[PDB]
Structure formats: structure tokens, C-alpha cells
């Protein structure tokens, strides 16, 4: 539930977003600090979902 | 330009967006000083058969 | 390298404006100090002669 939102740490893995984006099941995709096309081109310290 | 798309992916028509239809079926330049208009066609194009 | 190029133009414009402003400030400062040094050198030449 939204008042107990599920928070997950992601680190130490290959992050390929092509499959995560090419699915048509999504209907709202707003990225703010980074343009989506650059997503497969960077490295990060840690990820939260 | 005229065509017919799945009703879900309308938001992929906007310039600078990405996605399967935008990535490798149809996409617009960086500026695209034109206009876009889309409308429902489930009563004429869609066939119950 | 971290953003798409339909909006990074704004960021570049910010940087250009700031740096040109600072460099213009430096040039004006140098001009004023050069005028003062010119006056001092003219006085020194007269005193010599």
C-alpha cells in the first residue's frame, strides 16, 4: 500500500534498460534529471526502487 | 503524414520521446515546427470480425 | 554527455553568459589600472626630463 511503499536497494549488477523500456505495458514514463536515451550509457553508485 | 496507431502509445508521438514505435517505426527531429492531432477510431477502423 | 540536445542549449547559454560577463569584468578592471599606470608614467617622464 502507498502508505507502506516498498523500497528496494539495487547495486552490483549490469543494468540494461532496453528490455525494461521496450515493453508496451507502460503508460507513464517521466525521467527528470537524465534523458532516457542516455540511460544505457552511464554508471552509478547505488539505485533505489 | 497520416497513419493509425495503437491507442495506448499516443504519447510516443511527441518529439524527443523514445519507445519502440518512436525508436524504430516513426520519430521526429529535434525541433519539428509542426502540429499533431489524433483521435479515436474504434467505430470505423476496428472490425468485430 | 549526460543529457539530450533539445534542452541542453539552455545550460550552455547559462555558462556562456556567466563566463563572458566575468571576463568582461576582468577586462574593464585591467583598463582602469592601465589608465592609472599611464598617468604615473607620464609624471615620471616629466620628472626625468
mmCIF file of C-alpha atoms in Angstrom:
data_model
loop_
_atom_site.group_PDB
_atom_site.id
_atom_site.type_symbol
_atom_site.label_atom_id
_atom_site.label_comp_id
_atom_site.label_asym_id
_atom_site.label_seq_id
_atom_site.Cartn_x
_atom_site.Cartn_y
_atom_site.Cartn_z
ATOM 1 C CA UNK A 1 0.000 0.000 0.000
ATOM 2 C CA UNK A 2 1.069 3.559 -0.760
ATOM 3 C CA UNK A 3 1.382 4.405 2.935
ATOM 4 C CA UNK A 4 3.832 1.474 3.256
ATOM 5 C CA UNK A 5 5.577 1.755 -0.106
ATOM 6 C CA UNK A 6 8.073 -0.974 -0.943
ATOM 7 C CA UNK A 7 11.674 0.285 -1.090
ATOM 8 C CA UNK A 8 14.470 -1.805 -2.602
ATOM 9 C CA UNK A 9 18.229 -1.329 -2.940
ATOM 10 C CA UNK A 10 19.866 -2.216 -6.262
ATOM 11 C CA UNK A 11 23.635 -2.415 -6.706
ATOM 12 C CA UNK A 12 26.465 -4.530 -8.126
ATOM 13 C CA UNK A 13 24.819 -5.670 -11.352
ATOM 14 C CA UNK A 14 24.503 -4.969 -15.062
ATOM 15 C CA UNK A 15 21.593 -2.563 -15.570
ATOM 16 C CA UNK A 16 20.204 -2.878 -19.101
ATOM 17 C CA UNK A 17 17.085 -0.753 -19.517
ATOM 18 C CA UNK A 18 16.276 -1.726 -23.115
ATOM 19 C CA UNK A 19 14.055 -4.640 -22.094
ATOM 20 C CA UNK A 20 12.714 -2.613 -19.161
ATOM 21 C CA UNK A 21 11.501 0.049 -21.608
ATOM 22 C CA UNK A 22 10.565 -1.780 -24.819
ATOM 23 C CA UNK A 23 7.566 -3.377 -23.103
ATOM 24 C CA UNK A 24 4.351 -1.662 -24.193
ATOM 25 C CA UNK A 25 2.702 -2.295 -20.805
ATOM 26 C CA UNK A 26 3.916 1.117 -19.570
ATOM 27 C CA UNK A 27 1.754 4.215 -19.960
ATOM 28 C CA UNK A 28 3.568 6.911 -17.938
ATOM 29 C CA UNK A 29 7.333 7.473 -18.257
ATOM 30 C CA UNK A 30 8.736 10.759 -16.903
ATOM 31 C CA UNK A 31 12.508 10.984 -16.436
ATOM 32 C CA UNK A 32 13.740 14.239 -14.932
ATOM 33 C CA UNK A 33 17.491 14.592 -14.439
ATOM 34 C CA UNK A 34 18.613 12.267 -17.235
ATOM 35 C CA UNK A 35 17.286 11.877 -20.757
ATOM 36 C CA UNK A 36 16.100 8.284 -21.319
ATOM 37 C CA UNK A 37 18.277 7.673 -24.383
ATOM 38 C CA UNK A 38 21.428 8.118 -22.272
ATOM 39 C CA UNK A 39 20.319 5.582 -19.652
ATOM 40 C CA UNK A 40 22.326 2.693 -21.126
ATOM 41 C CA UNK A 41 25.457 4.871 -21.156
ATOM 42 C CA UNK A 42 26.291 5.712 -17.519
ATOM 43 C CA UNK A 43 27.443 4.269 -14.201
ATOM 44 C CA UNK A 44 26.005 4.996 -10.761
ATOM 45 C CA UNK A 45 26.784 4.470 -7.088
ATOM 46 C CA UNK A 46 23.513 2.896 -5.917
ATOM 47 C CA UNK A 47 19.910 2.574 -7.068
ATOM 48 C CA UNK A 48 16.609 2.768 -5.191
ATOM 49 C CA UNK A 49 13.296 1.408 -6.471
ATOM 50 C CA UNK B 1 1.660 12.417 -42.503
ATOM 51 C CA UNK B 2 -1.306 10.147 -41.810
ATOM 52 C CA UNK B 3 -1.499 6.704 -40.214
ATOM 53 C CA UNK B 4 -3.122 4.623 -37.460
ATOM 54 C CA UNK B 5 -1.531 3.621 -34.155
ATOM 55 C CA UNK B 6 -2.451 1.657 -31.068
ATOM 56 C CA UNK B 7 -4.427 3.961 -28.798
ATOM 57 C CA UNK B 8 -2.057 3.482 -25.863
ATOM 58 C CA UNK B 9 1.172 4.814 -27.395
ATOM 59 C CA UNK B 10 -0.177 8.211 -28.500
ATOM 60 C CA UNK B 11 2.224 9.951 -26.117
ATOM 61 C CA UNK B 12 5.150 8.497 -28.075
ATOM 62 C CA UNK B 13 4.398 10.866 -30.968
ATOM 63 C CA UNK B 14 5.789 13.897 -29.120
ATOM 64 C CA UNK B 15 9.282 14.972 -30.252
ATOM 65 C CA UNK B 16 12.246 13.799 -28.223
ATOM 66 C CA UNK B 17 10.359 10.814 -26.827
ATOM 67 C CA UNK B 18 11.634 7.254 -27.095
ATOM 68 C CA UNK B 19 9.999 3.860 -27.379
ATOM 69 C CA UNK B 20 9.591 1.042 -29.859
ATOM 70 C CA UNK B 21 7.330 2.981 -32.224
ATOM 71 C CA UNK B 22 9.441 6.106 -31.780
ATOM 72 C CA UNK B 23 12.773 4.251 -31.732
ATOM 73 C CA UNK B 24 12.295 2.261 -34.929
ATOM 74 C CA UNK B 25 8.939 2.968 -36.561
ATOM 75 C CA UNK B 26 8.430 6.755 -36.641
ATOM 76 C CA UNK B 27 10.147 9.720 -34.967
ATOM 77 C CA UNK B 28 10.521 13.472 -35.322
ATOM 78 C CA UNK B 29 13.503 15.858 -35.496
ATOM 79 C CA UNK B 30 14.839 17.947 -32.617
ATOM 80 C CA UNK B 31 12.559 20.906 -33.416
ATOM 81 C CA UNK B 32 9.642 19.751 -35.627
ATOM 82 C CA UNK B 33 7.938 23.102 -36.061
ATOM 83 C CA UNK B 34 4.613 21.489 -36.974
ATOM 84 C CA UNK B 35 1.485 20.234 -35.252
ATOM 85 C CA UNK B 36 -0.050 16.885 -34.314
ATOM 86 C CA UNK B 37 -3.678 15.792 -33.986
ATOM 87 C CA UNK B 38 -5.040 12.364 -33.057
ATOM 88 C CA UNK B 39 -8.498 10.951 -32.451
ATOM 89 C CA UNK B 40 -10.386 7.767 -31.643
ATOM 90 C CA UNK B 41 -11.181 5.323 -34.450
ATOM 91 C CA UNK B 42 -12.690 2.281 -32.746
ATOM 92 C CA UNK B 43 -16.039 2.700 -34.532
ATOM 93 C CA UNK B 44 -14.860 2.689 -38.164
ATOM 94 C CA UNK B 45 -11.407 1.095 -38.411
ATOM 95 C CA UNK B 46 -11.978 -1.550 -35.733
ATOM 96 C CA UNK B 47 -13.747 -4.671 -37.013
ATOM 97 C CA UNK B 48 -15.600 -7.087 -34.742
ATOM 98 C CA UNK B 49 -14.648 -9.814 -37.219
ATOM 99 C CA UNK C 1 27.349 13.733 -22.298
ATOM 100 C CA UNK C 2 24.586 13.344 -19.693
ATOM 101 C CA UNK C 3 21.630 14.970 -21.477
ATOM 102 C CA UNK C 4 19.821 15.050 -24.805
ATOM 103 C CA UNK C 5 20.314 18.080 -27.078
ATOM 104 C CA UNK C 6 16.874 19.763 -27.331
ATOM 105 C CA UNK C 7 17.233 21.436 -23.915
ATOM 106 C CA UNK C 8 20.967 21.444 -23.089
ATOM 107 C CA UNK C 9 21.127 24.598 -25.216
ATOM 108 C CA UNK C 10 19.714 26.428 -22.183
ATOM 109 C CA UNK C 11 22.506 25.122 -19.954
ATOM 110 C CA UNK C 12 25.160 26.113 -22.480
ATOM 111 C CA UNK C 13 23.632 29.582 -22.779
ATOM 112 C CA UNK C 14 23.816 29.955 -18.994
ATOM 113 C CA UNK C 15 27.507 29.050 -18.985
ATOM 114 C CA UNK C 16 28.318 31.339 -21.920
ATOM 115 C CA UNK C 17 26.584 34.321 -20.330
ATOM 116 C CA UNK C 18 28.327 33.840 -16.999
ATOM 117 C CA UNK C 19 31.814 33.396 -18.402
ATOM 118 C CA UNK C 20 31.587 36.304 -20.844
ATOM 119 C CA UNK C 21 30.331 38.522 -18.020
ATOM 120 C CA UNK C 22 33.247 37.592 -15.752
ATOM 121 C CA UNK C 23 35.836 38.035 -18.494
ATOM 122 C CA UNK C 24 34.388 41.437 -19.416
ATOM 123 C CA UNK C 25 34.656 42.476 -15.768
ATOM 124 C CA UNK C 26 38.323 41.490 -15.760
ATOM 125 C CA UNK C 27 38.978 43.451 -18.955
ATOM 126 C CA UNK C 28 37.400 46.605 -17.525
ATOM 127 C CA UNK C 29 39.481 46.299 -14.354
ATOM 128 C CA UNK C 30 42.664 45.980 -16.397
ATOM 129 C CA UNK C 31 41.683 49.011 -18.480
ATOM 130 C CA UNK C 32 41.245 51.252 -15.441
ATOM 131 C CA UNK C 33 44.515 50.154 -13.856
ATOM 132 C CA UNK C 34 46.312 50.708 -17.166
ATOM 133 C CA UNK C 35 44.994 54.273 -17.301
ATOM 134 C CA UNK C 36 46.336 54.943 -13.810
ATOM 135 C CA UNK C 37 49.741 53.488 -14.714
ATOM 136 C CA UNK C 38 49.795 55.660 -17.840
ATOM 137 C CA UNK C 39 49.298 58.786 -15.747
ATOM 138 C CA UNK C 40 52.090 57.729 -13.387
ATOM 139 C CA UNK C 41 54.457 57.045 -16.286
ATOM 140 C CA UNK C 42 53.775 60.458 -17.813
ATOM 141 C CA UNK C 43 54.578 62.095 -14.477
ATOM 142 C CA UNK C 44 57.795 60.078 -14.209
ATOM 143 C CA UNK C 45 58.856 61.066 -17.729
ATOM 144 C CA UNK C 46 58.290 64.745 -16.965
ATOM 145 C CA UNK C 47 60.241 64.457 -13.720
ATOM 146 C CA UNK C 48 63.101 62.786 -15.582
ATOM 147 C CA UNK C 49 63.245 65.419 -18.311
#
